[PDB]
């Protein structure tokens with residue numbers, strides 16, 4: 001294991017990863033990463049990046065791990081490895097309160113829909129909606145999506161359900177917004193939970209993260225840290 005593990009994250013996805021008023025990284029991903037590093041007896045350096053630059057940075061050895069609500073998908077397992085599941089993640093649309101929008105091609109006719117570049121939401125929306133004439137706009141970060149949604153430039157946005165609820169719907173900017181239909185189920189695109197992204201050959205590092213994650217779940221640390229942000233079973 002390296003003496004210092006470099007962990008990449010995109011800090012625009014509260015409650016998982018974001019910045020506080022002093023610029024410190026905060027959220028459930030940060031708490032999990034720091035606790036796992038403590039148990040692994042390694043020092044940790046957090047590195048902020050746009051989400052779509054995380055896998056390229058990991059492959060180029062600029063970072064050693066990704067903790068950034070990274071969904072475990074078949075496509076990504078062909079290029080990188082993952083730790084065991086950190087928590088569940090499903091994608092769901094948001095739109096103005098009272099909107100008739102549903103996550104269907106018919107409902108989205110003539111709508112402007114924002115997605116994060118590099119995300120499972122972008123991959124799903126581009127293949128199923130953009131090809132079929134929905135104006136799917138990809139963004140460098142999720143904060144730009146929420147801002148364009150509030151400016152009226154977007155009609156809807158697709159992202160992880162827990163991030164939209166806690167990071168936007170339950171925040172001042174999101175009071176005028178709500179979920180638009182149910183979460184989207186699609187095995188191929190959305191994967192099964194999130195994990196620490198790692199290079200495929202870093203077998204010792206994966207085993208260390210997996211061991212620390214099991215240990216923090218066994219002793220109840222996982223649930224106690226989760227309580228700060230969630231009143232439900234985020235693990236799934």
Ligand SMILES: NC(=[NH2+])NCCC[C@H](N)C(=O)O
Nearest residue numbers: 010013068069070071119120
């Ligand atoms: N920190 C972030 N911006 N995370 C975005 C994650 C979205 C989705 N779970 C994915 O893996 O594509």
Ligand SMILES: [Cl-]
Nearest residue numbers: 024025026030
């Ligand atoms: Cl910090």
Ligand SMILES: [Cl-]
Nearest residue numbers: 038041042043
């Ligand atoms: Cl240490």
Ligand SMILES: [Cl-]
Nearest residue numbers: 084214217218
């Ligand atoms: Cl288990």
